[PDB]
Amino acid sequence: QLWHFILELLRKEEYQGVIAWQGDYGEFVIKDPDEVARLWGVRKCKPQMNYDKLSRALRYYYNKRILHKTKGKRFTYKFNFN
DNA sequence: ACCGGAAGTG
DNA sequence: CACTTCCGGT
């Protein structure tokens, strides 16, 4: 799953240059959109992956209450731990 | 950047 | 299903 993959990355320091926790409890910011996508596209063997396609995937999680967007902030989503 | 509909995949 | 692909919107 993607939200899995995100968390997989987010509990490893060796990717803080790419993606890390910021602001509130469950908030996280993608520092390098294009790189992340490349890695997810490596993992899913989909070479033609990019943030546009990944970001759509994320928005589908809004209805499913796993994620939502922190408005105003760039590349900043937040998990639904409630 | 960020959204969400729409059609396709295995 | 859980995305990927595409694209015309805000």
Q: Assess the beta-strand content as a share of residues.
A: 15-25%
Give me the secondary-structure category: alpha+beta
Helical segment count? 3
**What pattern of helices and strands is seen along the backbone?**
HEEHHEE
Major sheet details = 4 strands, antiparallel
DNA-binding region: 1-80
Protein name: ETS domain-containing transcription factor ERF
Subcellular location: Nucleus
Family: Belongs to the ETS family.
Short description:
By secondary structure, the chain is an alpha+beta fold.
Set down the secondary structure blueprint.
Elements: H1 2-10, E1 19-21, E2 27-30, H2 33-43, H3 51-64, E3 67-69, E4 76-79
Antiparallel strand pairs: 1-2, 2-4, 3-4
This protein binds a DNA duplex (10 and 10 nucleotides) through residues 1-2, 44, 46, 48-49, 51-53, 55-57, 59-60, 62, 69, 74-75.
Subcellular location: Nucleus
DNA-binding region: 1-80
Family: Belongs to the ETS family.
Explain this structure.
It is classed as dna binding protein/dna. Keywords: Transcription, Tumor suppressor, ETS family, repressor, DNA binding protein, DNA BINDING PROTEIN-DNA complex. It forms a trimeric assembly. The entry is titled "Crystal structure of the DNA binding domain of human transcription factor ERF in the oxidized form, in complex with double-stranded DNA ACCGGAAGTG". The protein has 82 residues and is of the alpha+beta class. The chain has one domain. It is built from 3 helices and 4 strands, in the order αββααββ. The protein has helices at 2-10, 33-43, 51-64; strands at 19-21, 27-30, 67-69, 76-79. The longest helix is centred in the C-terminal third of the chain and has 14 residues, at 51-64. The chain binds a DNA duplex (10 and 10 nucleotides) through residues 1-2, 44, 46, 48-49, 51-53, 55-57, 59-60, 62, 69, 74-75.
